[PDB]
């Protein structure tokens with residue numbers, strides 16, 4: 001067990017230890033690794049390659065700005081990966097490609113403005129994708145195929161519309177977060193999101209420390225009227241970004 005951490009069974013707790021880097025001596029038998037709430041700024045390539053039995057990896061609340069390619073490739077048993085509240089500007093191609101058993105992926109509160117095109121293509125079991133508080137300007141391609149999602153958090157980005165049909169196959173959704181985006185209700189492309197929210201009022205949520213059902217929390221930019229109230233006749237294809 002690493003000096004600065006505490007260990008019990010197969011859980012290694014290095015949370016809130018003022019760590020500047022991943023400590024040495026994490027046993028290969030570790031299944032749960034808390035590295036959150038530290039000041040880790042960089043992850044060496046291969047730092048996790050030994051930890052083939054990892055099931056939950058908490059890297060949230062650090063100072064990561066990038067990730068090396070292949071960082072998680074050995075962690076095939078991973079079901080929860082937390083990267084929220086770092087400063088990630090981008091993700092490398094194929095960063096999640098080997099995490100076929102992943103169920104929860106936390107990417108919120110970073111500086112991501114886009115994702116690689118195939119970033120989610122192998123996450124055939126993902127149930128929660130949490131991506132609030134970034135700089136996303138378009139819905140990442142591949143979310144349309146994450147049919148087992150129950151939680152999708154897109155709040156507080158820079159999204160102006162949702163591509164037509166993007167949510168139609170997400171029939172297991174119970175929590176959808178859309179507030180805090182400058183939805184462009186003059187542009188004709190807004191109609192899909194308008195029509196989808198009107199048909200899914202019970203699953204659109206806002207956040208006041210916890211989930212609160214509010215289908216009106218998706219608001220039109222410039223005004224304070226809900227996206228779901230927009231009439232098609234008030235929109236035009238010529239007023240799109």
Ligand SMILES: CC(=O)N[C@@H]1[C@@H](O)[C@H](O[C@@H]2O[C@H](CO)[C@H](O)[C@H](O)[C@H]2O[C@@H]2O[C@@H](C)[C@@H](O)[C@@H](O)[C@@H]2O)[C@@H](CO)O[C@H]1O
Pocket residue numbers: 060082084085106108109130131132133153154155177207
């Ligand atoms: C790993 C983990 O459990 N992370 C939690 C975050 O996911 C939570 O973030 C909140 O997530 C919901 C979706 O479930 C929604 O997207 C909220 O907007 C988001 O909260 C944002 O981020 C927080 C850090 C605060 O800045 C809040 O004001 C934001 O609106 C947070 C909730 O505090 O808990 C983490 O543990």
Ligand SMILES: [Cl-]
Pocket residue numbers: 191195232
């Ligand atoms: Cl329409």
